[PDB]
Design a protein around this nucleic acid. Structure first.
Ligand code: NA
Length: 90
DNA sequence: AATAAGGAGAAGTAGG
DNA sequence: TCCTACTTCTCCTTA
């Protein structure tokens, strides 16, 4: 089953939800969620996973923060902005 | 107040 | 047994 960071990277590569998520600096692997349209993307994650409850941006962000230590995704000090590791991108 | 992003400890679920 | 990789719930902080 797909991991959250890979779901996000795949969306960014396919362009299927361009109004919910986008690259900020492609070279650096930084990306940003839409304030008004991120919930539709969260919903899609939960459905893809088959989770019992409806997924929310808050629960998705709780999972994203757990990558901070291992480094796949790190929060950037800009609104709604995160960064993939070079390993994840490579 | 209302809204929103950011945060995390604790406990539950999935699939090894 | 006991960890993975989240999910869900609840409450706190800052803007
Ligand atoms: Na929010």
């Amino acid at each position: 089953k797909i991991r959250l960071y890979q779901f996000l990277l795949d969306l960014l590569r396919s362009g299927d939800m361009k109004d919910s998520i986008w690259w900020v600096d492609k070279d650096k692997g930084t990306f940003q969620f839409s304030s008004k349209h991120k919930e539709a993307l969260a919903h899609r994650w939960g459905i893809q996973k088959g989770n019992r409850k409806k997924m929310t941006y808050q629960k998705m962000a709780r999972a994203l923060r757990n990558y901070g230590k291992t480094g796949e995704v790190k929060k950037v000090k800009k609104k709604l902005t995160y960064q993939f590791s070079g390993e994840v991108l490579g």
